[model samples]
Target: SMLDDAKARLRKYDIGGKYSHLPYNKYSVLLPLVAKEGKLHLLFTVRSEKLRRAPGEVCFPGGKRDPTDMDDAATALREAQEEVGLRPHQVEVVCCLVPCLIDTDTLITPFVGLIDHNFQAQPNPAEVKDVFLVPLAYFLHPQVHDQINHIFEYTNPEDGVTYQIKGMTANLAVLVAFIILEKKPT
Candidate 1:
């Protein structure tokens, strides 16, 4: 059911992609996984404000794609290793999904990978404050919806653009999962 739900959302995505800076903006992210007794769980990092992109926000360990990397999967693996101390060899990539467009800056290629829970996570102090795990069951919970509101307006001169601050919302990807998890699978 998770696969079907994920695939359905992926299909709805427009091919427009991240932005014009294809090679430059491409980045990879991992849905870090750990197989438990009969199910799997996902891991996420709460980023520090000092980080470049989403400061003081929760995110999966990842960064911009590096040219030296062979592919998006490689980039994800490499970033994960650097940020969370996950050795590339330990992760078994389960799937490489279609690229999802995010604004005009980056197209994120999300990959799902599982590793032994015994592996240690050494997070970069400057980028991440703590590493935490969320069971897939929790993500499917309906109560986990992204609380939305009207934030504010901030104008930037360097970017030469005014952006409306729509209150926080979990974009579609996590929203669907949140509902599924809320249902309490039997």
Candidate 2:
């Protein structure tokens, strides 16, 4: 029932996607949703500290699309498997949102999907540091952004250091949560 509501809402706003004509590095990411104790939580990955670029930042499971991949959704699923061992068959994609032209050089698409709440992520250490989940309701909490600027932050359970969800990761999370909840934090 909870997922059905999300599916309907996402489908209503789904603008569709197909920006193949553009000459930018194509990318896609999956916003993995899992139901836990009657509520939904969004999954995220923390970039490994050893990475050369954007080391130790919070983000989603995705990467540059491969030519072998069939389409945008394939890119998202393949990357998710590569980064977190979340197999393609394990995710039930809800809808494809409008593609994002993140910058002059990248056009990334965000896909919303539902996964088993019992699914465990096997993080690829070379790319992902750890995997975590933030409850959808937390984003809608009235005081979440009132105490200060709305810089999204999540504490890594492994090291206990708080990491900011910057860049497209931050934007997509806020947007998806707001859309599905159909309400903004007061």
Candidate 3:
């Protein structure tokens, strides 16, 4: 039932044909899982301002694909290693999810990885402000998964039509929302 719920949730957002070649570019995402308190914990990051996204934002550890890269899986692993000092040996590669197109138009591939709780995470200061762990159960919460959202939009004064949403709404607050929400229907 939980798997079914996951599948159904995915279908709710099952976008057709990957139009990934959007304005931004195709990138990858890392969903690293670790053993925490006998359960799984997701490793995530809050990006720094110098990066493209800029300033406090909740995101999985990942980045864009390199032209010389072997594949998206490799890209996700490499980026995680580079960004958080996560050695390939430290990670247990799980499986990759379907590519999702962000509203920004960037194609992002989400890769799931399993890591031991003892794995020490050394985050890059230039890129990541802090590295932390969140429980997987928290993400499964209905309060987190089943929520409404809005994306703000605006026009730039100088560029004349060049602009982005000032402060868009996201379920970032619910990144760990699964904790308060219901179980994954198991």
Q: Write the per-residue lDDT of candidate 1 for residues 1-186, one digit (tens) a residue.
A: 554443444345423234424654787778776655555556777677687766766667777886798777788899888888999778876565556666776678777666766888888888787676554554433233233642322333345443222222223225434533444437
Q: Number of clashing residue pairs in every model?
A: 6, 0, 7
Give the winner by lDDT: 1 or 3. Answer: 1
- Winner of 1 and 2 under TM-score: 2
Candidate 2 Cα misplacement greater than 4 A, ranges: 142-150, 155-161, 183-186
Between prediction 2 and prediction 3, the one with superior lDDT is 2
Model 1: pairs clashing at backbone N, Cα or C within 3 Å: 140-180, 140-181, 140-182, 141-181, 141-182, 142-182
Against the true structure, candidate 3 reaches a TM-score of 0.64
Where is the poorest 10-residue window by lDDT in model 1?
A: 164-173
- The sequence of per-residue lDDT tens digits that candidate 2 reaches over residues 61-95 is 88888889887888899989989999867899887
* TM-scores vs. true structure, each candidate: 0.67, 0.86, 0.64
Best by lDDT: 2
Q: Could you give the candidate ranking by TM-score, starting with the highest?
A: 2, 1, 3
Candidate order by lDDT, decreasing, is: 2, 1, 3
